[PDB]
Amino acid sequence: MHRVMGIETEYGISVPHQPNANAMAASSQVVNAYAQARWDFGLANVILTNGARLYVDHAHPEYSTPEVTNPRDAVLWDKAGERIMAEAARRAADLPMGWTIQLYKNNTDNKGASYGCHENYLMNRSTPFADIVRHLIPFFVTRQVFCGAGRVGIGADGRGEGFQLSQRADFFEVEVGLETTLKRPIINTRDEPHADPEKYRRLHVIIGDANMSEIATYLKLGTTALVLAMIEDGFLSQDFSVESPVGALRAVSHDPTLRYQLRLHDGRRLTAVQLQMEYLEQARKYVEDRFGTDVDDMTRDVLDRWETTLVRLADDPMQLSRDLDWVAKLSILEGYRQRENLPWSAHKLQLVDLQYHDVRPDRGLYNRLVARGRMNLLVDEAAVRTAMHEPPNDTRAYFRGRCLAKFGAEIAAASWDSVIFDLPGRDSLQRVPTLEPLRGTRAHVGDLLDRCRSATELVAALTGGENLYFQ
Amino acid sequence: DAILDEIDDVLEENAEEFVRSYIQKGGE
Ligand SMILES: Nc1ncnc2c1ncn2[C@@H]1O[C@H](COP(=O)(O)OP(=O)(O)O)[C@@H](O)[C@H]1O
Ligand SMILES: [K+]
Ligand SMILES: [Mg+2]
Ligand SMILES: [Mg+2]
């Protein structure tokens, strides 16, 4: 698999028993207590040596992965973000203020507020947006059957009793739009690629729940990428559009038995699982048609896992309790409901819903499941730890992160599309543009970075070579 | 359930106060 992608996750943040605290201050402590160099364009905003961004957004600490090229790397650097958040909070506890800061990789307080886990995908600019919209809406409406993180409470305000597949569904209100904080659209239309806008669209997806499960994050990014390849190539000839897709989004979420039927415009009546099976079958045909059996292993793995998950969801979803967040969480919830005869309104069930996402290794419920061997993993912890400080090798995040590690004292600022150097003696800053996501890689600049012992030597060697190393 | 005993061991104290106090600013 090769598609430039990334995940931005806003974390919930709680500072109990500190009347002097506010969410912006606590988010700043988290970002600042971890780190490094500033963001290039007054909130705390840091670029890390793994190429990630750590910053305060809307009174939430937010982690954005480096650009990666495949869904396994998306999982890996996204999981490293969880470790960075947990460590950041632990370091903030040693600041003079002494705050115990709790962080949650979820999307709602169950009281009407929501915050986002966004996926970004690089696409051909030429692909017509009307096709992007009409083929993605039904996919996004239904992919929560394996992407959902689970939620106790129905309706944005949480007043309805019961369990649902996703946290985000109740907050989406329209099909298409610019918004990210209110009246949220199934398809967000912002197109800000931080790359050659003549070549690339950046698809900014906002509808997904943050996932703890690595299998869920892998499927979320990997299946979406496969659907994007079909959309770009004009491969989908059928009409998957449904009547009232916003209503369908909510109704699919609110039926964890997975029997609710969408009403397709072409007359078909299909469950969300059934409609997902139609996308999967087209993806299989697409890959066979394009590559034969010359398919890369990861594409094959995504297709196989997508199919197995849908087959098991249709048979008995509880056999997925080691793979999907909403199933793993529901298994705990129903266990307590059976053991202690609890209605869905019980406060203990609300606590399980939230604490599932706590980043602490010793207290977060997903993390306890992993500790007891009750969750399947995709990557191992040693690789996650390495990904906290090393960038991916095959995107421009390589140059960004390695510059920060090796020449941090001489980096004035950095962003997705530039690194800005502050060289000794020069009374002027050197801005090195990194405009192509698939340049600035180890194959392009690794040897050069190895040889240079100073940022001055590096900027000298890069001078006039922008259209070699970076564009 | 062995696992429910593990979850019981780690759940936040004052569960009702904890849930009531978990109030977040809207994000994206
Ligand atoms: N050209 C691109 N194509 C696809 N994904 C990208 C591209 N550039 C950056 N990304 C990813 O998008 C995310 C940007 O995060 P952030 O700066 O928080 O976005 P926003 O401006 O939407 O808040 C990162 O995870 C990054 O890896
Ligand atoms: K975003
Ligand atoms: Mg962001
Ligand atoms: Mg944000």
Author numbering:
A (entry chain A): 1 to 35, 44 to 49, 79 to 508
B (entry chain B): 44 to 71
What does the report in the manuscript say about this coordinate set?
Pupylation is the post-translational modification of lysine side chains with prokaryotic ubiquitin-like protein (Pup) that targets proteins for proteasomal degradation in mycobacteria and other members of Actinobacteria. A single Pup ligase enzyme, PafA (proteasome accessory factor A), is responsible for modifying all pupylation substrate proteins and likewise a single depupylase enzyme, Dop (deamidase of Pup), removes Pup from Pup-protein adducts. Depupylase Dop is structurally homologous to Pup ligase PafA, although the two evolutionarily related enzymes catalyze opposing reactions. Rather, before the catalytic cycle of Dop can begin, Dop-mediated cleavage of ATP in the active site must take place to generate the Pi species important for catalysis.
The phosphorylated Pup intermediate resulting from phosphoryl transfer to the amide side-chain of the C-terminal residue should only exist transiently in solution and be readily hydrolyzed after its formation. However, when crystals of Dop-PupE complex were soaked with ATP for 19 h, we serendipitously produced Dop with a bound phosphorylated Pup fragment and ADP in the active site. Presumably due to the high concentration of KH2PO4 in the crystallization solution, a potassium (K+) ion instead of a Mg2+ ion was identified at the n2 site, as indicated by the strong anomalous signal peak from data collected at around 2.0 Å wavelength, although under physiological conditions the n2 site is most likely occupied by a Mg2+ ion. However, the binding of K+ at the n2 site does not affect the binding of ADP and the C-terminal Pup residue, as both bind in a similar conformation as observed in the transition state complex. The carbamidyl phosphate moiety produced in the active site of Dop through a transition state of phosphoryl transfer is stabilized through coordination with three Mg2+ ions bound at the n1, n2 and n3 sites. In the subsequent step, a nearby water molecule, most likely activated by the side chain of D94, is responsible for hydrolysis of the glutaminyl-phosphate intermediate. With the crystal structures of Dop-Pup complexes in all intermediate states of ATP hydrolysis in hand, including the ground state (Dop-PupQ-AMP-PCP), the transition state of phosphoryl transfer (Dop-PupE-ADP-MgF3(H2O)−), the Pup-phosphorylated state (Dop-PupP-ADP) and the product state (Dop-PupE-ADP-MgF42−), we can develop a full mechanistic model for the generation of the catalytic Pi species.
